[PDB]
């Protein structure tokens, strides 16, 4: 079916959307939002100079209507999400977001109830807008490049004043083979120091639950889960983390989850491979010593 991918020039994210497109047809087109060479070979590609959906006016939607696209694919990213809902409305299209799987017969899966439930959907009448959850589909290798036709943007409603990267330390969370996550149980920002220490020793990265982020003990980009980062380390230490389902959603493919929690009834022990019921202020220093 006639498919349009709308995304930044990012090859990892574009690749995930190409994988999804292949379920639906052989030759997707692409609208690139912002700058950067377009990798991959497409039948037709376009470019809009702005990444904020509010600034696009009606040109894009009118194009989609003219060209009779049947499927529009975006990522579940701030940029994808800024566009997807409003664009669906302009098309009169159904929208399904945060898609986690699509079967060969095009049954579409997504989560409900804090990632405790899996819902399955069938499209009855398109066009259809989908937003695809990051890190749930393999990224296609993108070979070659494709030139883009410039499209007009609309009235500027939102100005981008500044883009500010979170200060980076050590290996990225989503790349690390060992992740050490602290939750509310850690008790303070300074108390995270021993988690940073053991993470450094293991060439890993430090993550956080929403509890620890809401306390200000780690920055927001350290949050792991449904609305944070998705990680699949060999080892995942969950320290002072109760294991709410929304947290568990970030670690489904972690190979060896190690729980350190003083509460033997904590939900994290239903996901963990190994568990220590006890005070992390005793466990982690002991672990560090044994490693030294």
């Amino acid at each position: 079916m006639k498919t349009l991918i709308i995304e930044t020039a990012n090859a990892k994210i574009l690749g995930e959307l190409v994988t999804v497109s292949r379920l639906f047809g052989q030759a997707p087109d692409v609208v690139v939002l912002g700058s950067g060479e377009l990798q991959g070979s497409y039948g037709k590609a376009y470019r809009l100079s702005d990444t904020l959906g509010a600034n696009l006016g009606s040109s894009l939607s009118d194009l989609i209507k003219r060209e009779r696209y049947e499927l529009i694919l975006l990522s579940t990213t701030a940029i994808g999400s800024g566009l997807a809902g409003p664009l669906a409305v302009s098309l009169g299209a159904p929208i399904l977001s945060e898609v986690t799987a699509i079967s060969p017969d095009l049954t579409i899966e997504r989560s409900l109830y804090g990632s405790k439930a899996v819902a399955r959907y069938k499209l009855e009448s398109g066009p259809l807008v989908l937003t695809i959850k990051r890190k749930y589909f393999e990224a296609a290798t993108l070979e070659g490049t494709t030139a883009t036709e410039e499209l007009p943007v609309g009235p500027q409603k939102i100005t981008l004043l500044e883009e500010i990267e979170e200060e980076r330390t050590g290996i990225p969370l989503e790349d690390a083979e060992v992740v050490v996550t602290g939750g509310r149980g850690i008790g303070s920002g300074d108390n995270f120091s021993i988690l940073k220490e053991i993470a450094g020793m293991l060439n890993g990265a430090v993550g956080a639950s929403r509890g620890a982020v809401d306390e200000g003990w780690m920055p927001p980009g350290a949050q792991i889960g449904q609305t944070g980062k998705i990680v699949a380390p060999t080892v995942y230490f969950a320290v002072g983390v109760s294991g709410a389902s929304q947290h568990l959603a970030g670690i489904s493919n972690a190979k060896c989850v190690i729980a350190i929690n003083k509460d033997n009834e904590a939900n994290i022990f239903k996901r963990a491979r190994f568990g220590i019921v006890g005070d992390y202020k005793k466990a982690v220093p002991a672990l560090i010593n044994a490693l030294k």
Partner: protein, 251 residues
């Protein structure tokens, strides 16, 4: 000046899978109901704006008549009134169209706030669909908002950091969590007093739904059969853990 916050009451979002069951593809009725978590972040931001600006703060919801008692928590936190459209649809277009009808009955509205995603549907769709229907700019995942000449200075959380934005005019913002919008906990006496604050009920309107069929909903089991390491003696426990990690080729 008037700020609208969209708040949705949901089944307890902290119930574990072990204890979670469906009736008719939705949560069993036994679970405690509550305003969703990002919804409360949005209410909190709205109350902070009310405090700074002298604005009215109107909570708008689409849902069950008996969720008023839970929406009144927003009144105790500082909202001025609740407007509830009675209805039971999960469809984002139906929800958004009904929220739009309620909003259109509030005179001039300067800003609309919503949660990043609801605490039962997990989707982050309704605020963008409503922005489209209202023909207003949508800003997802805002964490802070400041009134300035001509509009709003907005900090947005992205996947690599944050963006500082200026919105000209009205808009719809969905709100993500940061320490600065952790919701305040209203006093028992504030809760009691909120029982008297205004609640306006509206009937549901006729409007179209999405042509999508929900085939099934299931709850995967969560049981890893964890190997619990005896930790009466913590030095022994970590010795055993490192041995097992070695044996299993994890570390």
């Amino acid at each position: 000046m008037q700020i609208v916050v969209l708040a949705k009451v949901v089944p307890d979002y902290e119930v574990p899978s072990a204890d979670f069951e469906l009736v008719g593809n939705r949560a069993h009725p036994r679970y405690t109901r509550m305003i969703g978590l990002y919804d409360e972040n949005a209410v909190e931001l709205g109350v902070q704006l009310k405090e700074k600006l002298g604005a009215d703060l109107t909570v708008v919801s689409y849902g069950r008549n008996d969720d008023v008692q839970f929406l009144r928590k927003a009144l105790a936190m500082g909202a001025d009134k609740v407007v509830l459209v009675e209805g039971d649809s999960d469809d984002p277009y139906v929800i958004a169209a009904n929220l739009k009808d309620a909003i259109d009955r509030q005179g001039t509205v300067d800003l609309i706030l919503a949660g990043r995603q609801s605490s039962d549907m997990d989707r982050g769709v309704v605020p963008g669909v409503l922005a489209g229907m209202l023909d207003l700019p949508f800003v997802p995942q805002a964490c802070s908002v400041e009134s300035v000449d001509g509009g709003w200075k907005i900090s947005q959380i992205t996947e690599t950091g944050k963006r500082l934005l200026k919105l000209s005019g009205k808009g719809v913002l969905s709100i993500t969590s940061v320490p600065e919008n952790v919701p305040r906990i209203p006093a028992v006496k504030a809760i009691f007093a909120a029982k008297k604050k205004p609640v306006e009920k509206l009937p549901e309107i006729g409007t179209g739904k999405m042509a999508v069929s929900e085939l099934s909903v299931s709850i995967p089991k969560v049981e890893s059969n964890c190997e619990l390491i005896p930790a009466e003696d913590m030095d022994d426990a970590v010795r055993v853990l490192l041995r097992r990690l070695k044996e299993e080729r994890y570390l």
